[PDB]
């Protein structure tokens with residue numbers, strides 16, 4: 001069991017093994033960049049804030065540990081290490097997670113290099129590939145946007161969650177529809193891709209209602225087939241009252257873009273989540289012919305998330321979390 005050492009960073013106490021050097025704040029859990037003096041590579045180390053404060057917190061701690069221990073894909077954050085100072089369960093009250101440091105996020109790439117059609121094809125391919133793997137474990141990202149995308153200098157990408165966000169949110173998450181299918185994340189990819197093509201935020205809503213108005217101006221007011229599914233008496237009368245926007249002709253909107261990009265955008269940015277292309281379908285889209293390889297778009301091992309429907313005690317969440325810390329095997 002390594003020797004730990006205590007350090008102070010922007011008001012936070014950090015106890016990590018010696019192995020991890022040159023800590024410097026990256027944001028606020030909180031996250032430091034560090035040098036792994038054991039393998040020679042830069043890492044990001046996340047310290048979980050108040051992991052066991054609530055039942056909701058204690059569960060979310062367990063969730064994060066479980067999810068990350070299961071993600072083993074090129075385009076999704078992976079776990080290099082997980083550790084705690086605590087030599088036993090009684091002492092246990094802090095959690096740290098370790099991943100590969102990617103040096104920049106996608107907003108950074110976007111505000112200071114105008115991207116080629118070839119770049120957009122590569123970056124969105126990678127999001128979809130990571131997303132196929134995510135979706136096959138039955139997991140929904142729900143908060144996909146450029147700041148949750150890590151990119152290196154070869155423009156290689158991983159999907160992650162640092163925890164407006166609204167600009168990339170599916171209109172149904174902002175109406176609290178509640179079931180949500182995995183294409184919520186495909187609506188996000190549409191917003192990300194549009195902005196990679198344009199250099200501009202597709203939907204810069206000022207707030208929650210402006211967001212929705214902006215979306216409705218692009219895609220139009222809901223079609224009969226969609227109105228049809230609004231089981232809620234509620235919505236329907238309100239929507240029919242609105243300025244009855246027709247769906248904008250996307251070719252006209254994303255003018256000079258590759259026509260396969262446009263066509264892929266029309267298949268992601270559909271109001272009706274039942275009609276949006278899946279991550280799998282999208283990888284087979286002709287827009288990605290240069291990068292597509294059906295033998296190299298792997299799906300995840302079965303993910304046991306029976307724990308999600310469980311209501312347990314803080315002490316149980318914590319002890320479960322501890323066993324997950326103990327059982328961690330690092331990758332090669």
Ligand SMILES: CN(C)CCN1CCN(C(=O)c2cc(C(C)(C)C)sc2NC(=O)Nc2cccc(Cl)c2Cl)CCC1=O
Pocket residue numbers: 031044045046060063064065067068071076077097098099134139140141142159160161162163
């Ligand atoms: C209900 N719910 C889907 C929304 C809230 N979630 C967020 C999702 N989550 C997560 O923990 C989560 C899920 C992820 C995918 C993309 C695979 C979907 S990535 C990630 N966490 C993460 O990226 N951590 C991290 C980031 C930078 C540096 C370091 Cl060092 C690390 Cl450890 C688990 C916690 C929770 O409850």
Ligand SMILES: CCCCCCCCO[C@@H]1O[C@H](CO)[C@@H](O)[C@H](O)[C@H]1O
Pocket residue numbers: 171172175177178179180181212222226229271272273274
């Ligand atoms: C302002 C009008 C925008 C509302 C967007 C509704 C489109 C979401 O799409 C809907 O999502 C649900 C999954 O949560 C599905 O159950 C519905 O069948 C599907 O049509």
